[PDB]
PDB file of C-alpha atoms in Angstrom:
ATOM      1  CA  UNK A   1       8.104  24.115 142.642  1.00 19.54           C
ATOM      2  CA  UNK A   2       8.280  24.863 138.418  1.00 20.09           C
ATOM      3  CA  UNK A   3      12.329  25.879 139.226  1.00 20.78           C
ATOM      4  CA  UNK A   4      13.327  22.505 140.943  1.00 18.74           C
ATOM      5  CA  UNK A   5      10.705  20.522 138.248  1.00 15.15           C
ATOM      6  CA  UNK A   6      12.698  22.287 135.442  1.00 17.69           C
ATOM      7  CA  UNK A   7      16.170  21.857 137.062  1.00 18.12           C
ATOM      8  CA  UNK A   8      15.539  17.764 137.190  1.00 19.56           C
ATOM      9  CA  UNK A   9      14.149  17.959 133.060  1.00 16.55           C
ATOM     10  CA  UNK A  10      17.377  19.391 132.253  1.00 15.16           C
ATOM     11  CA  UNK A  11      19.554  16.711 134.486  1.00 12.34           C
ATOM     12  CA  UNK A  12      17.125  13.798 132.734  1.00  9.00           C
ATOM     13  CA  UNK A  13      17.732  15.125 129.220  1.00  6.18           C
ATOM     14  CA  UNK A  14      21.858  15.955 129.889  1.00  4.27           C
ATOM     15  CA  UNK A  15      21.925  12.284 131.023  1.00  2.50           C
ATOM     16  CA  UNK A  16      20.565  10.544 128.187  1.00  4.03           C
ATOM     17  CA  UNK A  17      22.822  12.473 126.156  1.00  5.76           C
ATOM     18  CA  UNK A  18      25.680  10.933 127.700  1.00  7.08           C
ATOM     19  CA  UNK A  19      24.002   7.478 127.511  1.00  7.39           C
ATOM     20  CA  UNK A  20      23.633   8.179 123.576  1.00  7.54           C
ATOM     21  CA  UNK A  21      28.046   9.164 124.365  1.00  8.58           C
ATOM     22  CA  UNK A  22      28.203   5.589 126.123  1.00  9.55           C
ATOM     23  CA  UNK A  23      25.848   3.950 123.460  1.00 12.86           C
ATOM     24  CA  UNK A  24      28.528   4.960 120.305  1.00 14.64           C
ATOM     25  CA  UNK A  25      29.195   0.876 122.171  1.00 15.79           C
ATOM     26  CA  UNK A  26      27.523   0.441 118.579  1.00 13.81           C
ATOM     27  CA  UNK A  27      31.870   0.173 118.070  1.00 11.02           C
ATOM     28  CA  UNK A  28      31.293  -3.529 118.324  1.00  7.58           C
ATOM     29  CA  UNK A  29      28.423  -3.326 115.661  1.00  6.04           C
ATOM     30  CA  UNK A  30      30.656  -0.693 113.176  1.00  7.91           C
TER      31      UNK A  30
ATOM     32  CA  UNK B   1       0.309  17.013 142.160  1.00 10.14           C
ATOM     33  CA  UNK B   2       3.779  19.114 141.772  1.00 10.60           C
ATOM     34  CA  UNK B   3       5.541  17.252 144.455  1.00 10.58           C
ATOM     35  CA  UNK B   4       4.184  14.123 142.650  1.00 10.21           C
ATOM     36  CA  UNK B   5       6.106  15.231 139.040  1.00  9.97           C
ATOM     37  CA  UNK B   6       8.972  15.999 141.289  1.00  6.99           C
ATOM     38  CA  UNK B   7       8.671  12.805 142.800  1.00  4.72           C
ATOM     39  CA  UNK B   8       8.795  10.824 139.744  1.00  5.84           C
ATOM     40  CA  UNK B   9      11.160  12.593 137.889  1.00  4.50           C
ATOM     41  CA  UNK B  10      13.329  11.973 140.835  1.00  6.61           C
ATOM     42  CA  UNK B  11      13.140   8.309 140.271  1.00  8.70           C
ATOM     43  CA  UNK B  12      13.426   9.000 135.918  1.00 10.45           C
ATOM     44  CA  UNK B  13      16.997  10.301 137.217  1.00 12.92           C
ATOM     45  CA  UNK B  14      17.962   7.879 139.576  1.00 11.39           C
ATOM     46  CA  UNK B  15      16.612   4.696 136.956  1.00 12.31           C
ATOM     47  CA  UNK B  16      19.095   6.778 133.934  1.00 11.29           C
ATOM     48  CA  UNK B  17      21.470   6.530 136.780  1.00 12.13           C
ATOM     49  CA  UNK B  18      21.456   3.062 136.629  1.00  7.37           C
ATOM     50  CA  UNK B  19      21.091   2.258 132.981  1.00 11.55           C
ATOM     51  CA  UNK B  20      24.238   5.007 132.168  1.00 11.72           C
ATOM     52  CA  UNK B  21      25.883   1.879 135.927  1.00  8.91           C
ATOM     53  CA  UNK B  22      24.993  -0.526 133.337  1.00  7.07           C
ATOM     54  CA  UNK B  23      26.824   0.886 130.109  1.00  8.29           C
ATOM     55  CA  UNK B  24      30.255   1.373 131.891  1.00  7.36           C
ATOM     56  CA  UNK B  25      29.601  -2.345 129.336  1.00  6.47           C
ATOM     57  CA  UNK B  26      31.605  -0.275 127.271  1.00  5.77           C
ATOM     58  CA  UNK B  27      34.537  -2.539 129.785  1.00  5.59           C
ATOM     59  CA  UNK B  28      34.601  -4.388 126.657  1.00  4.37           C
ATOM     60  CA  UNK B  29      36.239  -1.779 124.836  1.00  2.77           C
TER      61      UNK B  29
ATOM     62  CA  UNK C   1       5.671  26.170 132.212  1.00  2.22           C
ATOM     63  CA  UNK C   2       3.034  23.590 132.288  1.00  2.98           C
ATOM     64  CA  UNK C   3       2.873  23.005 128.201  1.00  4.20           C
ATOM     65  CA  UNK C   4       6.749  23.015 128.558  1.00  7.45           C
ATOM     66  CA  UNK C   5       7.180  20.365 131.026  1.00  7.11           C
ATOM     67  CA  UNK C   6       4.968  18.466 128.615  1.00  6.61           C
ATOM     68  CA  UNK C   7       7.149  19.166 125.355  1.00  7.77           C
ATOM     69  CA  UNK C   8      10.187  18.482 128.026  1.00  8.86           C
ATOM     70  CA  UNK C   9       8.752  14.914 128.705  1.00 10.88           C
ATOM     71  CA  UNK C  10       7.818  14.499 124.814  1.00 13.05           C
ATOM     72  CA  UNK C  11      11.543  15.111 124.023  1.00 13.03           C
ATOM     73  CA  UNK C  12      12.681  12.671 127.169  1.00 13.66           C
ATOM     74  CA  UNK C  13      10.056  10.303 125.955  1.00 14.51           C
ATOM     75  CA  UNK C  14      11.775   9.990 122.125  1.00 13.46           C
ATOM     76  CA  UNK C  15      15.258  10.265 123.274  1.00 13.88           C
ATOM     77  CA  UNK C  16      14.251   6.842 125.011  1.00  8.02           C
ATOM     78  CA  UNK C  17      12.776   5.381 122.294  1.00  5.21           C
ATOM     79  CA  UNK C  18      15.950   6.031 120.026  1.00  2.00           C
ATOM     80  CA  UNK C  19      18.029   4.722 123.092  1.00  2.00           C
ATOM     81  CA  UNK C  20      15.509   1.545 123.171  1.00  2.56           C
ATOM     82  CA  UNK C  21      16.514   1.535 118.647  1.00  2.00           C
ATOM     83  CA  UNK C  22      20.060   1.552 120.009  1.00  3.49           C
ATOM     84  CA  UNK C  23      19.230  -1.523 121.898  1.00  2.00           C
ATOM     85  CA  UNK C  24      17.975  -3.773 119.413  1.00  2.00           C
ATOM     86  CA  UNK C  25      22.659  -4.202 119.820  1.00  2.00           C
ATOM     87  CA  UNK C  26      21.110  -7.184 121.644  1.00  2.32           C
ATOM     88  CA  UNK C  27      21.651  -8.404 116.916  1.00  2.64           C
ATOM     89  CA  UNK C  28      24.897  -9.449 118.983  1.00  2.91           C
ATOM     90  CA  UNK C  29      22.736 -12.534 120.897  1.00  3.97           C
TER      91      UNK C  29
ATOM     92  CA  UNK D   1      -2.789  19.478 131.792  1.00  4.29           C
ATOM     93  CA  UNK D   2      -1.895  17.876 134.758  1.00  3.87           C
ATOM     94  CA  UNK D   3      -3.156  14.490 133.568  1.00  5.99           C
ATOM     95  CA  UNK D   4      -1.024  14.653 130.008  1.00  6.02           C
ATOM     96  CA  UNK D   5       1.839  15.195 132.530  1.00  6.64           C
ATOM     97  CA  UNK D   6       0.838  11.980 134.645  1.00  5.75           C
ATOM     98  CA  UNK D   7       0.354   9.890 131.453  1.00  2.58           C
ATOM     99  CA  UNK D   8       3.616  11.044 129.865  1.00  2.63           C
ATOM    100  CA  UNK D   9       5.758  10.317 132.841  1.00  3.98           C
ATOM    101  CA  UNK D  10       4.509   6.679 133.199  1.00  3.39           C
ATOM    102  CA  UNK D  11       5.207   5.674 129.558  1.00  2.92           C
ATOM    103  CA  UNK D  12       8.703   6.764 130.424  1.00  2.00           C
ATOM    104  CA  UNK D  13       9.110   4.988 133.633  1.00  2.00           C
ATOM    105  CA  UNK D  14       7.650   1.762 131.544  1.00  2.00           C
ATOM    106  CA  UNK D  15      10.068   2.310 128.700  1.00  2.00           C
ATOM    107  CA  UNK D  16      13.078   2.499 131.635  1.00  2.00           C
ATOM    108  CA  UNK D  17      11.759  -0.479 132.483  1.00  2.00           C
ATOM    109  CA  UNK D  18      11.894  -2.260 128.859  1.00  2.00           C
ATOM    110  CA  UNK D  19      15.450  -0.667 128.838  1.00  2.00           C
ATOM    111  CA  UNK D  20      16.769  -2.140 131.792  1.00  2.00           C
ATOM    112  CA  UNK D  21      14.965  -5.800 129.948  1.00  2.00           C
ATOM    113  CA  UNK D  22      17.300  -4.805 126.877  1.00  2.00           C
ATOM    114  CA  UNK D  23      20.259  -4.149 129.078  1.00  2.00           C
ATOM    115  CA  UNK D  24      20.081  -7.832 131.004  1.00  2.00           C
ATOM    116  CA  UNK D  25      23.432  -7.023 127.217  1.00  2.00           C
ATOM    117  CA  UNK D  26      24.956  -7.447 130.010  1.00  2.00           C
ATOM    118  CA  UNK D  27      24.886 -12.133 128.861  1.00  2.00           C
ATOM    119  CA  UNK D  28      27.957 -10.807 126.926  1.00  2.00           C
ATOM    120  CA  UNK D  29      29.385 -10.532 130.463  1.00  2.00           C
ATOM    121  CA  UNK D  30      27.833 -13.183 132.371  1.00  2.00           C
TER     122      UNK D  30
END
């Protein structure tokens, strides 16, 4: 159903903004 | 078809999951 | 809703390529 | 269109995949 397809895009996006949060491991880099 | 895109995007989340399971690399800091 | 679960998996699609960008930290080996 | 949908979600599981390739990162730990 379009509600529990849209609920799961916004959970995929709001993860890979915390992996981008995690990925400031560019530290060791700068 | 729409249980299929649910399906998959199921197993997008559980593979970022992993990957943000992985990145706890940041251990080294 | 179906031409925005397509601009949805655009944006998902280029947020992992910038995360696979961030990657090339494998420099380090 | 359905098939767009289809196409796009498979280059994302295959770029996962090349991810999780990048992420064997984890040499600086073993």
């Amino acid at each position: 159903r379009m509600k529990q397809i849209e609920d799961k895009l916004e959970e995929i996006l709001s993860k890979l903004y915390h992996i981008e949060x995690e990925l400031x491991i560019k530290x060791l880099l700068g």
